[PDB]
Amino acid sequence: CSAMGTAIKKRNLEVKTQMSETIWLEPSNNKTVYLQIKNTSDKDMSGLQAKIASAVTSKGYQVVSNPDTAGYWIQANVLKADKMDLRESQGWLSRGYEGAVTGAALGAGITAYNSSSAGATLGVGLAAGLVGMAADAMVEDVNYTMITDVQIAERTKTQVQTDNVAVLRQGTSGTKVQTSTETGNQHKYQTRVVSNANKVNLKFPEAQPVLEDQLAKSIANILGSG
Amino acid sequence: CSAMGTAIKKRNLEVKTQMSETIWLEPSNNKTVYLQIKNTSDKDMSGLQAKIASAVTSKGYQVVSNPDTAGYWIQANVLKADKMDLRESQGWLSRGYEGAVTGAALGAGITAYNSSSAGATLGVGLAAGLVGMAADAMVEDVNYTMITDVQIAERTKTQVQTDNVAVLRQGTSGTKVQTSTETGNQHKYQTRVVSNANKVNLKFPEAQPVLEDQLAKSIANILGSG
Amino acid sequence: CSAMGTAIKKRNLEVKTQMSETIWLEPSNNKTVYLQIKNTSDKDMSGLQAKIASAVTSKGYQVVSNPDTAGYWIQANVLKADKMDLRESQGWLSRGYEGAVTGAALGAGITAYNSSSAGATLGVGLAAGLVGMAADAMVEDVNYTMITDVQIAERTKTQVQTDNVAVLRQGTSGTKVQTSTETGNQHKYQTRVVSNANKVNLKFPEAQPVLEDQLAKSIANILGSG
Amino acid sequence: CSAMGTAIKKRNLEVKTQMSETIWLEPSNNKTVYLQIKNTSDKDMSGLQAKIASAVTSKGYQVVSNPDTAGYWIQANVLKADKMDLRESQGWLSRGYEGAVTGAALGAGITAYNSSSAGATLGVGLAAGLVGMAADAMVEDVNYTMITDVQIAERTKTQVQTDNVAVLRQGTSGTKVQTSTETGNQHKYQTRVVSNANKVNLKFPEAQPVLEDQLAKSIANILGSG
Amino acid sequence: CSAMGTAIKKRNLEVKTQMSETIWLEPSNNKTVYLQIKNTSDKDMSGLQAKIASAVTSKGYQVVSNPDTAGYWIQANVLKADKMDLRESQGWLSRGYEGAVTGAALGAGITAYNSSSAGATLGVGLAAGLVGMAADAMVEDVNYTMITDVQIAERTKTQVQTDNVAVLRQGTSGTKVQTSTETGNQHKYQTRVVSNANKVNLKFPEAQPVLEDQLAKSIANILGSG
Amino acid sequence: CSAMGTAIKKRNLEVKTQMSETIWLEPSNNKTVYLQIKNTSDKDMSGLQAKIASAVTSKGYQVVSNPDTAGYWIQANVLKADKMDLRESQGWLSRGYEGAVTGAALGAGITAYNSSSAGATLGVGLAAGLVGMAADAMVEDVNYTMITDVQIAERTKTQVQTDNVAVLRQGTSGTKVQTSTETGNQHKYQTRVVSNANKVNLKFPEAQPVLEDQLAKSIANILGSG
Amino acid sequence: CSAMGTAIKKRNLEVKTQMSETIWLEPSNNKTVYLQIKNTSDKDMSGLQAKIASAVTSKGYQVVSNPDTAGYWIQANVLKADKMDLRESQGWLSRGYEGAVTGAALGAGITAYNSSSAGATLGVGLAAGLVGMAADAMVEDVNYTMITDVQIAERTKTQVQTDNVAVLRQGTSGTKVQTSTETGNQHKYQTRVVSNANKVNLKFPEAQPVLEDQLAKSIANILGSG
Amino acid sequence: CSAMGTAIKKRNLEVKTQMSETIWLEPSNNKTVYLQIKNTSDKDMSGLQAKIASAVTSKGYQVVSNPDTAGYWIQANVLKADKMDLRESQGWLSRGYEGAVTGAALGAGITAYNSSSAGATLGVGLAAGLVGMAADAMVEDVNYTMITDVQIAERTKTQVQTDNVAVLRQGTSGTKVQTSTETGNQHKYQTRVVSNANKVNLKFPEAQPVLEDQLAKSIANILGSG
Amino acid sequence: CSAMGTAIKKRNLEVKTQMSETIWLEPSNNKTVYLQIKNTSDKDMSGLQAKIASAVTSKGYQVVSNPDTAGYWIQANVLKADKMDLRESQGWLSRGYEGAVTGAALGAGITAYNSSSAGATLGVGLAAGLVGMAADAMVEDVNYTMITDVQIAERTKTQVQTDNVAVLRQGTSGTKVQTSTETGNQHKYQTRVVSNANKVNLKFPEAQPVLEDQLAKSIANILGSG
């Protein structure tokens, strides 16, 4: 059974968290960190801010509420979240066909037993095939993919020139190009973290705590155990 | 049955809302937001503007009606909406063929019963096959895809130069290139939100409230819980 | 039956209207709109101008007949219209083959009845197969695709320079390049609206009113509920 | 029968006329139009100029014979015309094979009747198969595709510089590049109109009147109902 | 029979003539035309010059023999001509296989008749199969494709600079680049005309008159009915 | 039989001659032509010079032996000649397989005749199959493809600058770039002529006269009937 | 059995560690190394820092805690870690199908033994097939792929100019370009190390010690046995 | 038999010689030619230089041994020579399989004759199959391809500047770029000649004389019959 | 047998030696050559240097040991050598499968002989199949491909500027670009020679003498028979 094979394979929650690329930070004596965590996804990660703060404080850093007097900024946005069924990557044999067959066959388990009436065996076989198809189709091999954008700002003594260049699309024909220049002492680096939570019939509120834990640990480990 | 498998799989409304990319906003003391929400799609989202206003006010911001004295602009356009049937991605076994066969076979359930007249059984089998094909073809696995364009304007102290460059197509041969330059204190950033509402025999007015709720929450969360 | 499945699936008129991209307009106090609606398609949309005017007036704008003293221009052209049959995307099984077979088989419904004469049954079976093929081939699953070009002109205080650049093809060898420069206070943005009207045996005059209604609502909603 | 299915499907003349791109014209008080219509195709469209003149005059414009004092020029060229059979897109089953089989089988309709002589039945079956193949092959599902080039010249007050640049090919090795510059007050825009006339066994003189009517209406509607 | 299907389908001569692109000519009072028609093809079009002259004179123009005092030049070259059999696009079933089988079978039409001697029937069947293969292979579905290059020179008042740039290949390694500059009052535009003559067992001398007629009409119509 | 089909199809010599592109020559009063014909191919075309001279003289030109005082140069090089079997484009069924089978079967034409001895029939069948394979493989469907390079030099009054640029390859690593500049009054244009001679078991000396005739006529017709 | 084949093939832990490219270091007398090891992966490598320190000290270098007075910097980041099952590269035959069949067949090992009751044999066969499918699906051929980024900084006497160029993405439309310039005496080179740990039913904590050992040896060997 | 078909097809030596591109030489009064013929191929062409000298002298030129006072240089290098079997383009049926089968079958030609002993017939059949496979595999359809580089130097009065540019590869990382400039009165042109010698079981010393003859004739004909 | 077919086909050593491109050398009076032959391949060519010296001396040149006073340099490096089996290009039928079958069948040659005991025949058949598979797999159709780099330096009177440009890769991130300029009177040209030695069960020491002979002859023939 494909459904039972999936239910056996992915029987326990499996969470993966992969940073896209490395952000290199010079050794520094800064201890203050300012956190700005946002969530533009349909899923709920409300404890991610507190978990990032706790992980950062575990490394000796101090979380401050004043962005101007903070050596580091951790700007994170839980940008996206998608849910997919991996079984559908197999096309057919995933809509309950084999689940209906296994159960249409089991309906013949009444012919060799008490009642072998043709109408009765047909009815029981049909009901068993329907129940088998329902059980096969109700096995959801769900994978939640989350995409988080991270932007670390480190305060330096070097004058950094920011050149904002926005190309705003304007109706299939034009663009409005906005350009501006600012000067400040802050190097900003970006990165992306991709999280995955896989399980059979997985409901997101079960995967949310571990997802937040791993994401917070990764984002805090960007700073390293200073 | 493929139709019944679909009706079981997608039996409850499933709404997804995914922002395209992250708009980074500096920590600010601005509290005023001006909303400009438009809808150039055939579907109806009349409550989206009010839901965005409520979500923004929940974060401590204040929605104002004067665009000139607003620290933030949320300009949103529900640009597009499409409806498709996902079953049609399977080609055949989606036009009622298998639903006709399941029912043409069930018409033989009269031969082994009261009347086994050849004309009667043929007629009942044909009617049952027609009804099965109709029921299979009437199972619509509908997916509504919505595209919303968001444009956030943040008022700054930096002089921003906007260079409008429109390349208007002119009859398969030419272009009229319009260029202009303006100066103002407003950085404009764009982004795109893709919404999906999936269900069996889904009617849009059922999916509209949750679609608006999720879209409003995402667009407001762009500003973050300031 | 493929024909019957199509007639069941697309039994009621389905109209879609999708704008290509968003035209962003700054908040403004302009209330005057000038409409220029043209139709270079073989289909007839004569009521589109009045419907656009009514939809625009519903938003508080005022439609004027003087292009020079109009804050906004709505220039629309119903550029193209095509009609196709979607069943032909399936290649064969859509020219009446299966509709002929279903009916050639039904011609055997005379052998088991009053007259089983070989000539008579052959003739009735042939006539029934011909009628079945005709009925299958007469089921038209028609989709009208309409392309409209929209050009919104908004009057500004910024000097706008228009550089007309036309590359006129000249006989497989040359081009005449026409260049000119104009100055005026009007930003012109473009966009495209794609309409679809789908039904079984759909005749365009039935789809035209709703097509115009949706197109007018979309084009007027470009301006937003000002 | 594929031939019969085609004869049923495309039983009445179907004419389509699609402009390639939109030519945008500013609102103007010009009322004079000069028409220059040419036909470098093997087909005959002699009434096209008169139909364009009538359609233009219906919009309030006035057709003049002096190109120098005309606000608008409508320069049209019926460049190309091709005729194809769409059945040949199916490869085989379109050269009379199935039409021969349907008729070779019908030749057996003499064995069960008056004369069942082996020579006689063979001869009648062969003749019937030949006639069936001839009738199937004589069913022409013809599509006429016509390509028209349109060049609208609008007289302006802006000085327009035309830079003629012709790259004349010279024997697989060279090019003669002719360049010249002229100055005049006329913006020239181009566009293309594609016409299709589809029917079974369609003869062009039947499709020519409606083809001209639709083409003239489209080209005149370029000017819009001024 | 594929051969019979071809002989029925393309039973009468079909001539097509398609100009590549449009050459736009300004309205002019010139009436003199100078013709220079050449033929570097293996086929013969000797009457093309006279037919072009007649068609041009029918439009009111006057054909002159002095190139210097001619308002228009019509320079045409019948560059290429190819002959192909379209049946060979089907690969096999076009070399006489099926024509041999149809006739090998007909050789059995002697067993059921006067002499059924094994040697006699084998010999007659072999001869009939050979004759059938010969007749099938002797059915030529011929298509003549002709390519003509046209170069129209129109005398203007604008000074036209011709920059001859020839890149003469020199033995797999080098090029001799010849460059020169001339000045004259003549705009030269090019174009290409593709002619097709299709028929079963078509001999070119039958297709030549109509081919010349259509080509001359097209090239003359480049000038338009001035 | 594939061999018989080929021998019937291509039973008479078929010669094609196609110029690559058109060389445009201005109307001129020059009457002197200088011919330089070379042949770097393995085939023999010794009469091509005389045939070109005769064709040129037929047009009123005069062939001269002094290159300096010749208005026109016809420089031709019969660069390449290849011979191929077209039957081998079919892969198998062209090495004698079917020719062996047709003849292995004909060896059974001795069993039903005078001697039906197993050894005798086996020997005769083997010999007949060998002879059939030999006859099939000895059917050569030969196509000679010839490539000629033509270079026409026309004497003008315009100063022509020739920039010789040769990039001589030097051992997989280097190039010696030779550059030089000359000035002379002669425009040189190139072109290519592709000839084909097709027949069954064609020997080149049979195709050479007509090949030369067609090539000479084409190259001379480059000049046109002046 | 595919599961048995996997369990036999990959029965013992196999660890691979491959550096991407070579970092060339000049011969030097520096003996001080500063280590900065971070881990932004979900896996745990806490002993990697100590192992790198031990391996470096084995080569004669001295690990220091002051980054400013260190001749060498070893900056390493265990960026990513993924876990996959290689059996799934075979598609089917890996979800327990063949493991179910091997065991459904073994359930017939009760018919030829003590109890051959149809119900009993069916039940035992079903249970054995379920157990076989479970055992097949419980065989995990796991491969852990770890990606580490290494950045070696070597202190020189040459002035090194660092030009920070960050292109921060801003919402699908814009980029903020940050540019800065610093000067210092430190050449920084990068590289990447890819580690793999393969085994059947491998749990990461078993592979972690050897993974750390190999990674530390490789990163330390970058410095060479100085 | 494929082997016998090949031995029949390519039974006599077939030599082809094709120049790559044309080297155009101006008409000249030079009569002195200097030959430099080299052979860096494994094959032997020792008589090529003498054959080129004889062919050149046949055209009226005079071969000289002083390169400085020679109007023309013919520099030729027989660069490459490869030998291949064309039968191997058919994959199998070319290693002796079918030749083994034809002979394994012929071993049954002893059962119906004097000795039908099972051991004897098996042994004779095996020996015959081995001999047939050996004979089939010993049929070599060999094609020798030769590549010759030709460099013609023509002495002129124009100053020719040679810019030697050699990019010498240096160990997967670098290049040494050598550049030099010389001035001399000699235009050098290149070209390539491809020779083919095809036959069954062809040994090169048989094809060498004709190969040299054709190559010499082509290279000498570059100069033309001056 | 595939193995026997290979052993028959490639029964004698076949050596090919192909130079990549031609190095053109001007006629010169230099007679001194300096040889620098290196071998960075795993194979042994120790006699190549002496063979090159002998071949060069055979042409009249004199081999010198002083690089500074040598008109020519022959710098050669036997860069690479690979050994492959061509039979593996056929995938299966080359690992002994067919060789096992031919021999498993021959094991049945004991049933029809003295002992037909089932155990005895099974054992003898298994042993014969094993021996056949071993003999098939022990037939090695080996091809040695050798790559030699040649660099000819010719001393000139022209000043040659060498621009060394080395781009040394530095750890997946950087490059050290080394540039230098030298001046000397020596043109250096490169080329590549590819050698192949093919035979069944070929051992390199048997192919080495002929490989060296051919390579030396080719490299010496670069200089030509001066």
Residue numbers in the entry:
A (entry chain A), B (entry chain B), C (entry chain C), D (entry chain D), E (entry chain E), F (entry chain F), ...: 36 to 261
What do the study authors state?
Following transfer of IncF-like plasmids, recipients become refractory to a second wave of conjugation with the same plasmid via entry (TraS) and surface (TraT) exclusion mechanisms. SFX, which is mediated by the OMP TraT, is specific for Gram-negative bacteria. TraT is a highly expressed ~24 kDa lipoprotein with a copy number of approximately 29,000–84,000 copies/cell. In this work, we determined the cryo-EM structure of TraT encoded by pKpQIL (TraTpKpQIL) and the F (TraTF) plasmid derivative, pOX38, at 2.47 Å and 2.66 Å resolution respectively. This revealed that lipidated TraT oligomerises into a decameric champagne cork-like structure, composing of a transmembrane α-helical barrel domain and an extracellular ring domain.
To gain insights into the molecular mechanism of SFX, we purified recombinant TraTpKpQIL from E. coli OM vesicles in CYMAL-6 and determined the cryo-EM structure. Analysis of the purified TraTpKpQIL by mass spectrometry confirmed that the first cysteine of the mature protein (C36) is modified by DAG and PA, which agrees with previous reports. The map displays 10-fold symmetry corresponding to ten copies of TraTpKpQIL. Each TraTpKpQIL protomer consists of three amphipathic TM helices (α1, α3 and α4) that anchors it to the OM, a central β-sandwich domain (β1–β7) that is flanked by two α-helices (α2 and α5) that protrudes to the extracellular space; β5 and β6 form a β-hairpin perpendicular to the top of the β-sandwich domain. Each protomer associates with one DAG molecule, where interactions occur exclusively between DAG and its own protomer. DAG is found in the interface of the TM helices α1, α3 and α4 and forms a hydrogen bond between its diacylglycerol moiety and the backbone of T137. The decameric structure is predominately stabilised by interactions between the extracellular domain of the protomers; the α-helical barrel domain does not display significant interactions with adjacent protomers. The arrangement between the β-sandwich domains, including the β5 and β6 intertwining, results in the formation of a cyclic architecture that consists of an inner β-barrel with a diameter of 48 Å. The conjugation frequency of pKpQIL into recipients expressing TraTpKpQIL was reduced by a log-fold, −3.6, compared to the baseline level of conjugation, −2.5, in the absence of TraTpKpQIL.
